[model samples]
Target: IKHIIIVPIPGDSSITTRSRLLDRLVRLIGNPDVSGPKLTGALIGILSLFVESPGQLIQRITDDPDVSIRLLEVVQSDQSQSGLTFASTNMEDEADQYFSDQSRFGWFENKEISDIEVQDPEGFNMILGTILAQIWVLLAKAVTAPDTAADSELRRWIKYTQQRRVVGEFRLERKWLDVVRNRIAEDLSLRRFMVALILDIKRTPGNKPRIAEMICDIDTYIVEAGLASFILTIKFGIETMYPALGLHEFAGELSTLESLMNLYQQMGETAPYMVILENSIQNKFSAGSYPLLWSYAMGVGVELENSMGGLNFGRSYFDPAYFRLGQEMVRRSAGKVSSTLASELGITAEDARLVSEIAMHTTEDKISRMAEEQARHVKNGLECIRALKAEPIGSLAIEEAMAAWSE
Candidate 1:
């Protein structure tokens, strides 16, 4: 059985540092009876100690002489077993090709490499799932933690988010979304694990309150981390990628506005959570942060659509749980929602007017042909209208409106 050594590095780590770490890690893996997966797990355990940095280990591990040979052996075994040529005559180039090809990771495939027992496809996925789950937990803790020290892990992560790095045309924020798309979105097991974690928290005494508090902490963190745009981008991407994850609904339940509304209704604590929500809406709208607020509203719309398949004709439309939430925003902002959307999204005043009307519908109604035609026109505006150059915002509004108009 051949052993393949895998060394993962943080996405932003320096090439020199990565190479040095790879050399050191490779030596550690050379110990007798140490498998690549075992060593990788060990590396993860070590890195978990320093949870402050937004460092993600493990992209591709290749290039060291000993590591290359082992990887080549695995490649040869794969080729012989599957009757496929995965390697080229040039050893170095072949190793580079093997490492660069994303398919070799085998998360998407059920096939397994026979000889490399520990580095088989299933093994890699198991290791990856564990790592991702742990990273997610750490991130959750970092955001929700009460500590505000400059040197704290929470602050470090916030600082990292603030630091700008340009790769090709993508900014630092885009890079984060990329990670979420590639890493978090595909891991259904990780999603299930997170759901389980949340279930446990809700079932446990005292921890139930932490759920709402954590949501509030995350909202505050978004502002402090300067991640309003990043939050919107990731939410849109994740919803599009895997709506079944219900991340939107999970977050919505614990959202500041939703929690406040609940408190106002149940505890009659209108003075606190309600006041906070109203002040937040006023501040965000007045500061021209409409897009950020609108993004969440659009997410609610997306989740509603996903829940009911498609918002077709002749469906009963009712106020969503968050319907009052939108009404509150409109009321608090004195009905600036439509105009703000029109100006920010650059849609026709008529289209924005119709969209806002449909989106904020509080009374039960059926889908009208006129509403359908208006939706079609909005969709066409998304495709052909240059005025609505920001297609995402426009489409988001349409979807939100569709959900609002449908039960």
Candidate 2:
């Protein structure tokens, strides 16, 4: 009645292979004849040489009305995450909280006092977007308890949208068609959307400090693009290092930053200082904080593309697939940032200003410069991303690094 498992079955599908995978899929779907593996993923390697093609495989998965409906309902409810989600709410909550905690500077810290930042703002924000995406994923992991505070907050937002009559009260705040004449036009709007959502979380009770974590959320795109190791490398240079954290790790950082940004904005009793921090982090991540991270990710991507020729990622999860997706996300997010800025910037200036005990706005002035430098780094990061797109590495990134290791 539920569940389907699929995998890359990349071989010439003789009846043997197809039946093997199909048998596994059927057995896993709940009512197996005398049973095989009751729950599992069946590798259906469709050798380009034979078997029903990828298109055929996909059609088969979604063609059945009942199965499609069930899966669609699942996707619609869970914001398009795939497969049957059997995850428990407890797991979701723990993941959310623990992820938030790990986002603190303590988690991202590597060595000491190098004011870290990335050189690509668009790429950076895209990374952060991925982080936000994960938080929502966690949020949607389990049905919200109706009486719970989080549930209530969700209701409030939903109600606001519900009040609008689609047939009559229709209002298109933005559109994608605008991307052609104005590629960057929507960038601000998307950024605003990002901030607005963070603010929405912040204004609610019990959501303050956590909003700062949201501040940190945008960096996930970069991390996924495989920038974490690269970013760490820029500061330390190539060397044996700590176990590289995963994309999910940066996702948590992004959420934590958003939450903290909100809380701290309230603290300083002044708005000037908060703005500085905002600019500092944004500029760093967006502009090009990762001279090292950028190089590392691109190098890896290029190496893999060349050596493997779009074949297997090989060895394991060391693949840079997320980097490709993250880049695409960046392109799309950039298209949405402008509208984001206009809508949110207007209402935020006064309230979000620095409320701290700084004697003068000079602190902001200094921070402003740092932000600009970081922003430049972010721009440099864009260069790195573009370069990767243009020149894909044919081997694994680590493989490339290893070749240079003996030198």
Candidate 3:
């Protein structure tokens, strides 16, 4: 619970020196005798030193064989003790309170879009597309409107919607928008042309009055058009793709989508709309999933060096020299590190090598399992989209918007 306020020392902060210092700190932190608050304080001190590149600390700690084993032991013991504490103290009441708090925030609530149970599916689709077109027209107009209070509020609203609530939350959609904003800021010709086109399209004589009305009471207009929910759901879907595709993010995107789709199905009329939405989402998910999957697998392989008490595995895992040297030499190197660890930690080289090999095998096994799980989700999502077989509705306004941009 105590804070370790680190003051910069003006000497010998070279990588070699820092690496050695980190090794010493890891050894101290891994010591079984250092328990409770003292251990926590030492861990905090190590964390404090990682202000620049935390990955450097991770790489250094994972590189050391004996230190990694000892640290895992400390971690395992602490985890076990923490579980016992949680189980023994106010477990039921705490669980209930947590769920209640989450429910109050509507995080767990399912809001389903109603089905358009009309007899004419084509006619309904036309009406929906027309409405969507109007919305897009309004958006284009708002984006290009002159400097006024309304325009300022519109800018604020757009920025507000794009902001992520939590630190370290990976929002690819927001990131893409930021890239676009930066491109526009730098006065890129293409972006400027696109903006000018939107402005030109919105200058149509009839749209002027609606634009004025929209600017006059933007909040009411947004709510009445049901745009807030539409925008939010799209954002949620974009955010969910990473976690669903096996990246180390939170789960629930697929579930949220499934619930919404189910609601649409139950309502009957909006089923086609759900299919169209799924098709778009699945396309993006499929395109990005493999690259993310490979990246996740590589990271897992590197982390296994620390978790498996293996030395130099991560350093050598992707090395071209090791690839040329062959698996036999790699095994030999692991044996050598294990021998060194055995002498220090009172374990056999054979035991150490066995554990290291297990780690490698398990890492591969886990990566395969994770890939399979993600593949299943992707396949299921695609299957639903395909099964619905709903013809995508085209919007005249959207086409106009696209044409404006192209010009």
The lDDT leader among the candidates is 1
RMSD values for the candidates in order, in angstroms, are 21.2, 27.7, 31.9
lDDT of 2 by residue, 1-407 (tens): 74342332423323333333232222222122211211212211211102234334333433222222111000011321211221333243322221122121221113232221224433323322322333332222121211133334433433343232111111111221122112112123222223333343434455333223333332222223222332333332223221232344444443443454465466564232222223343333321433323333443333322222432223222325544443333333333343345447573434333322121232224456567768999999999999999988877886989888965
Q: On TM-score, who's better, 1 or 3?
A: 1
Q: What is the per-residue lDDT of model 1 for residues 361-400, given as tens digits with 9 covering 90 to 100? A: 5221325434775899999886766755644366788899
Candidate 3 wrong stretches, greater than 4 Å = 1-344, 367-407
Candidate 2 yields a Cα-based lDDT of 0.31
Off by over 4 Å in 1: 1-69, 72-324, 327-334, 337-407
Task: Give residue 288's lDDT in candidate 3 (0 to 100).
Answer: 25
Across residues 1-407, which tens digit of lDDT does each residue of candidate 3 receive?
43222211112334333333333333333333433433333333333232233333333333212222111101101233121112234454332321122121111012231222233434333322222222333333333222134335444553354223111121112322332333233322322223222333334356343223233344333222322222333332233232233424313444454555466458474332222223343223221222222223333333332232321223212333322223233334454555566658887766776766754454445466567778999999998898767754467877988999995
Task: Report lDDT (Cα) of residue 69, candidate 2.
Answer: 16
Taken over the whole model, the C-alpha lDDT of each candidate is: 0.34, 0.31, 0.34
TM-score of each: 0.20, 0.17, 0.16
Candidate 1 residue pairs that clash? 8-58, 9-58
Best by TM-score: 1
- TM-score of candidate 2 to 2 decimals: 0.17
Between 1 and 2, whose lDDT is larger?
1
